[PDB]
Structure formats: structure tokens, C-alpha cells
Ligand binder design. Sequence first.
Ligand SMILES: [Ca+2]
Ligand SMILES: [Ca+2]
Ligand SMILES: [Ca+2]
Ligand SMILES: [Ca+2]
Ligand SMILES: [Zn+2]
Lengths: 49, 82, 380
Amino acid sequence: VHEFFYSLLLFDLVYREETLLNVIKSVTRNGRPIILTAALALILVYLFS
Amino acid sequence: QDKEHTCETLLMCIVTVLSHGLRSGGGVGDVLRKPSKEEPLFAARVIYDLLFFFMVIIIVLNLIFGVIIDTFADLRSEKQKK
Amino acid sequence: PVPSICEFLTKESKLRIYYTTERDEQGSKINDFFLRSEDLFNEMNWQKKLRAQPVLYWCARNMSFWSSISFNLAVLMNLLVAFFYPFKGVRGGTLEPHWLPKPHGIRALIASTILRLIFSVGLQPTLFLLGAFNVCNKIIFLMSFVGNCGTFTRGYRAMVLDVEFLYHLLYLLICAMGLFVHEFFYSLLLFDLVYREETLLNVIKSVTRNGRPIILTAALALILVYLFSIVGYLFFKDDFILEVDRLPNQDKEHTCETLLMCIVTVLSHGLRSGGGVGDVLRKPSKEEPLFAARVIYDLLFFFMVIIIVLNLIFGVIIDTFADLRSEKQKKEEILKTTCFICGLERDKFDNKTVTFEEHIKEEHNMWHYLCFIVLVKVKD
Ligand SMILES: [Ca+2]
Ligand SMILES: [Ca+2]
Ligand SMILES: [Ca+2]
Ligand SMILES: [Ca+2]
Ligand SMILES: [Zn+2]
């Protein structure tokens, strides 16, 4: 189809690498705290607007 | 280059604040027009800018980053123990 | 034999008593556990009394339903206010078409009815109807809450003293004013998300647990900017030229004429700018007699304030947010691997006769101790 589809193949680096998976698990392990904090930021900017 | 009004609708006003004030490093007071010291609402503008900066930029984003740091230390602690 | 009244505990109260009991400076949970015995007895009495009312019991048996309905309706009306305000002017759609789980189907049907109502009758009537329904659901929830808690038998001093009841009354008042005064009052209802959510409360406690360090650091930053503004007023009076624009009934303007305005300029522009105060002051030439003074002033402001004080506030926040995790881990680990009553450790039961698991549910079960206390209290 298009040569640009080879860009998605870089995501295999996370699968192949063990340390990068841990660095990602840093943000995905407590992702609910982060989602809730983002919602709180949305509430604050809504009030300020 | 011509200026344009953006807070005519509440949705556009929210979009302006959330897309410019949040991304700017100095808060929302940098995208709004800067007032003179003779305005009746100069103090109100100063207080609004400072409150936005302190509550959002200083606190909430740093709080997200602190969450990330604490999790990234919790993983190391449990891995060391295991 | 366990008393007959002991069967009137909800699981929620049991979990709360198991989790929220604190060790004393002795290292024992016995005193705090005993201090809640009379409260547990009184609420068992109220639970037994609630049997005779078949409708109040049904209403008080559905906290989750009323709370979830109220929260969902609040967020729905808040998005509807945000996206379509002001409601002056309606644009129709009508394109070439248009536009197993039971709870998902119910939510989808409710959303379909809501969208048909908003596209059929209008915006303001829909908002009014939604606000009225929210007020009705809130009063139902309030009746359910007061029925389940049952503290109204203690007199109106109990209503005044507690805070959850007061919080719900302010919630209801805000809903009523949003229905009657202005639609913008529904924005305050988003603060119930912090109340409903457990993790967000901990993330807030990160900053509120040592808030005095942060207040003191902010005061120190104010002192530093005050000193820097004094120095600037003394030596760099004519460099405080800022850009302004006058609205009709871009020209520069002097701002450090008064010490108050000079402080305001420094504190509102230098502190917010990422490069210090040297970016809002007029930039000098290399032939000026005070070029080195300006460079030193800019660098000192940057290094002392931007690099140090703000990062120090953030470090305070990080350290508190790690302290909470440390103490929670310690408390939960003590909870898991130690008998509630005698306080013995798990390793004492490694291979002797009976294991720890049956020890903490047959011979030192705390619920049996509570039953014995109730029996002694109720038996003649
Ligand atoms: Ca920007
Ligand atoms: Ca950040
Ligand atoms: Ca600025
Ligand atoms: Ca910072
Ligand atoms: Zn025992």
C-alpha cells in the first residue's frame, strides 16, 4: 500500500527490549492516578475558563 | 497577521485556555492581552494570572510527575526485595 | 453462643473496622478496637430497627445506585453546558441518515432518550428537566443516607457536628441554585469526584500532608522577590519598561515608578517567565556602564529563585508523596502478617500444631471478641 507503514514496525523495539518495558511499566502501573490527575486538571481549566 | 476574538463561545474559550495557557510555560497570562496599570481590573488580571499559574502549572503537572517518580521507585523497591 | 443481634452487621462496617484501626504508641490495636465497640453496638441496634420499615430499608439498601446516578447526571449536564453555551441558536442535523450486558444497554437507551429529547424539545427545557431530576435523585440519596446512618436519633447536635451530612446539603443547595439561578453552578459539582475517588484523595494528601513546608517555602520566595525588587528599584529604575496595549476608548510603559508596582512587575513576570526576570526588562547594550551589573542581577535571580526555590517546593511534594507510600506499605504489611489480637508474628506458627491461618480465624478471631463484648453488654 504505502512505504509509510514501515513506521509502525518500530513498536517491536518495546517488545524486544526488557528494560524499556520496565520504563513503560513505570507509567502504566498506576495509570489510574495519572488519569484522575488529568481529569482534575481538566476541571481546574474548566473553572478558570 | 490580524487579531481575532476567541472567547465568544464558551467552548472556544475553554479550547483557548486549555490549548494555550496549559502549553505555555508562564500560564494563561501570556496569551491574553496585556493590560495597562490604569485599568480598573489590573489587580484582578494579576490575581487571575498568578492563581492559574500556581494552582495548575506549579502544582498539578508536578503532581503528575511526582506520581510517575513514585511508581518508578516502587518498581525498583519490589524488584530488589523479590 | 453468639448473640442474635450480632447478625446485623453489613460487610462495609466490618471492613472499615478491620482497616481503619490504628496501632497505639504501645504497638497494639486493642484500645482503638475497643473504642469502637459501642458505636458498632448502636449501629447494630439501628440495623435491627430498620427491619420494621420495608420501604426505608429498600431506599437505604441502594447507596451505590443513587450515588452513581447523581454523578453520571452531573457530569452529563456539565459537558452539555460546556459544549453548547450559550443555548441561543439551534442547528439541526438530519443528514442522509441521522447524527448481553444489561447496564450497558440501559445506559445506551438512556442516552438515546436524552439525545432524542434534546433534539426534539430544545436545550433549555432539557437542562431544566435534567436539573429537576438531579435534585430529586439527590433528595432520595439524602433520605437514604440519613436512614442508613441513623444518627438523627441522637438529636440535631449530631446533624450539626458531622460533616458528610453537611457536605451533601451543600451539594443539594448547589444543585438547586444551578437549576434556578444559573447553569454555571453545575461546574462546582465536579468536586464530588475527589470525594468519590480513593486514589485521588491520596494524591491530594501528597500536597496537603506537609502543606506547612510549602507555605513556608512560598513565603521565602516572596521574601526573595521582595529583596530583588528593592534592588531593582534602587539601581535599575529606568530598565522596568514593559509593553502594553491600550484598548480603544502597542506602546511601552514604565512600571517601577512605585515600589508596589515594581514588586508586582517582578513577581508577576519574572516568576512566571522561565528565564527569570531578565526577559521582561529592557535588554542592554554591551557599551553600557551597568552591563555587568545587569548580567549578574539576571543570573543571581535565575539561580536563586527559578532553579532553587521552585525545585525545592517540588522536592517537598515528591518527598511527602513517597512518605505516604512508605507508611502505607508498612501498615499494610503489619496488617497481613500479624495476628490482630495477640500481635504475634506469622513465623511463630511455622510448623507447630495449628497454623497461623486457622489461628487468626478460630482462636483469635476479633469478630468473636466483639460478639463476646456484645453478649456481656446485653446479657443480664
Ligand atoms: Ca503557546
Ligand atoms: Ca511536568
Ligand atoms: Ca511572562
Ligand atoms: Ca517547579
Ligand atoms: Zn492471635
